[PDB]
């Protein structure tokens, strides 16, 4: 489960980089470095701050992951200056519910105390769409006036709160991810915004 | 004394941060986000070079007194638009003056050599800053006019020359705070430049 | 061999740093900041990474290297300002080519697996860079048309094919850099740009 998870918040990161470096008309190896920094980029801070070995050192499996991923984006799509805005902030969203759980949950179960667990949850969700747009000189996610990092803080909180209630980690980070990725969409679909 | 140190380094660098993100009519969330970063942006750089835990997460109630100087920063706080650029050099040049010396000091007694220690030092006080500026896509502050870094490895290498005196560390920071304190505001309120 | 191609790649990415910094009419100390973030900006996200002392703190002599560097781009330059862009890019290119390979080398003598140690080769080699480019808010080297990251790749990757052939490291390094630098200055000499 967690396997698949992991694997598909890579994917997810890494689409969301590749999409953005097409914009640009970059070349193929452009594609992939803009792809891999937004797919490993929350996680390596994850992993030094909990001074644990870095998930896709550790798993080499995850580069060839973000390789595949970064490839097909490139083959698959024919023209992506053009791409709709929507599919980049839905990719954006997918891995931003995922790693903001996932986070948490292995902060959590790493030692981590509960406030120090939801914020390297958030930071694994947004710090790889962070250094993606700055690299870019587009403004983050975080200033923008879509509802985006209380979607990142509701997901890792939420866990929390459901693995008080003895609930089993699948089910608590289901009813987690879905509860801040549905928040995330509706900000997306409907430009929800806070005063 | 250095645990009353610390925390208002934190309160300091998280009240640049929320009140940069007032100028930019953010949520509370996006406060939050950009008050966290520029308060822990300094101290967890320094520790993970250190290979040392870092500070809020080794003690969770510095996360919540940058929750803390967030939100009462966004309550006590009318029209934060509007607010002077004063007050926002001055908080940064507080936590500027402190972590430069607490951070080569801390540093110091880690086994970092004396070269080692004033950098260390002087990554602590500007680099949370330097994060907070390069999100909003303002122009950093080693960049402008004013005297700066100057400022922050005067207060690091000061330390040192006094700890080499056989002063005790209360006394050796407390005159290195001040002089790196000075010399940052008097280029602040006189907008002293070095050619 | 190993002690040379360190301080002669800290020596290139600081004077490419203090050349940026001479364009904005900095002061001095501004010029060492910027000298330094790019120095040692690639080495210590691959130090950290790898949970391996960071090469700076381990040994302080490269920080003398770095002000020596910056210190000597002050004085034996008089205008900055108008200093043309092509020594600006052989500056980076050097260190590109150089840090993508010793990256690659430390990291796989370290324990990293191939696909690990190229990417901390590749990071080693252009973060330096990256660093400096958005801190000026100047567009990064990946965005641009000419060659960049594939010689970063192609540096690393080649040190492992060599390596695999039974090469010693000295034979195998020299070769890399080579066949990085000259896909990578020939990109700045004749524009050659990827489609």
Redesign the interface.
Known sequence: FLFYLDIFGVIVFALSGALMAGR?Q?????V???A?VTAVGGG?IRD????T??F??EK?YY??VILATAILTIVLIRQPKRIPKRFLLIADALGLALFAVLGTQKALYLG?????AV?LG?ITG?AGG?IRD????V??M??REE????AA?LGGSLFIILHGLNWNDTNAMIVSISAALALRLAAIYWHV???
Chains 1, 2, 3 share one sequence.
């Open positions: 640009y970059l070349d193929p190896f452009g992939v470095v803009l891999s390596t030094v701050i909990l001074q070995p870095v896709w050192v080499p580069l060839y981590a105390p509960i406030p120090v914020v958030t947004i962070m700055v690299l870019c000189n403004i983050p975080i200033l509802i985006y990092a209380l803080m915004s806070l005063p």
